[PDB]
């Protein structure tokens, strides 16, 4: 069901190396609905190539637009299993400190802060 379940560590590592080769300015991001989630839709896809200069605050706006949310729906975005310390950090900086050992940056969203 989840991305890590669908692809071998080898396949995830090689895909990241290829994004490096072909999409060198992009951060490879996996974005997944919380398995417990009732309110928010699932995304049309899992793997997002994010320009490396956008900050976390803009990536939240992008995903809320991708989900076609309205002003008073709640949306929480976990990175590498935990709350974002700050929405102002550029995603290039977030990648270097929060990337998985496979080379992807793993995110999960819910309507609840208590996932
Ligand atoms: C904000 O992230 C989304 C942008 C679209 N995307 C791309 O693949 N980018 C376009 C270009 C061919 C690589 C990943 C999802
Ligand atoms: Cl690029």
Tell me which H or E stretch contains 66.
helix 56-67
Q: Write the DSSP symbol of residue 105.
A: E
**Domain limits, the chain:** 1-115
Resolution in A: 1.8
Ligand 1 center to residue 101 CA distance, Å? 22
Is residue 8 within 8 A of residue 31, CB to CB? The reply is: no
Which run of H or of E encompasses 28? strand 26-33
Q: Which among 51, 60, 46, 56 is positioned nearest to 97, based on CA atoms?
A: 56
Indicate if ligand 1 lies below 6 Å from the C-beta of 62. yes
- Tell me the technique behind this structure: X-ray
Residue numbers after which the chain is interrupted (C to N above 2.5 A) read none
Longest dimension (CA), the chain: 41
Give me ligand 1 centre to Cα 58, in Å.
Answer: 14
At residue 20, φ and ψ (nearest 5 deg) are -55, -45
Q: How far apart are CA 45 and CA 55, in angstroms?
A: 21
């Amino acid at each position: 069901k989840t991305f890590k379940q669908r692809r071998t560590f080898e396949q995830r590592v090689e895909d990241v190396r290829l994004i490096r080769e072909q999409h060198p300015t992009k951060i490879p991001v996996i974005i997944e609905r919380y398995k417990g989630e009732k309110q928010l839709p699932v995304l049309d896809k899992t793997k997002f190539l994010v320009p490396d200069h956008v900050n976390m605050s803009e990536l939240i706006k992008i995903i809320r637009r991708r989900l076609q949310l309205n002003a008073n729906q709640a949306f929480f975005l976990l990175v590498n299993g935990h709350s974002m310390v700050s929405v102002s950090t550029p995603i290039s900086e977030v990648y270097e400190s929060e990337k998985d050992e496979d080379g992807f940056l793993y995110m999960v969203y819910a309507s609840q802060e208590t996932f």
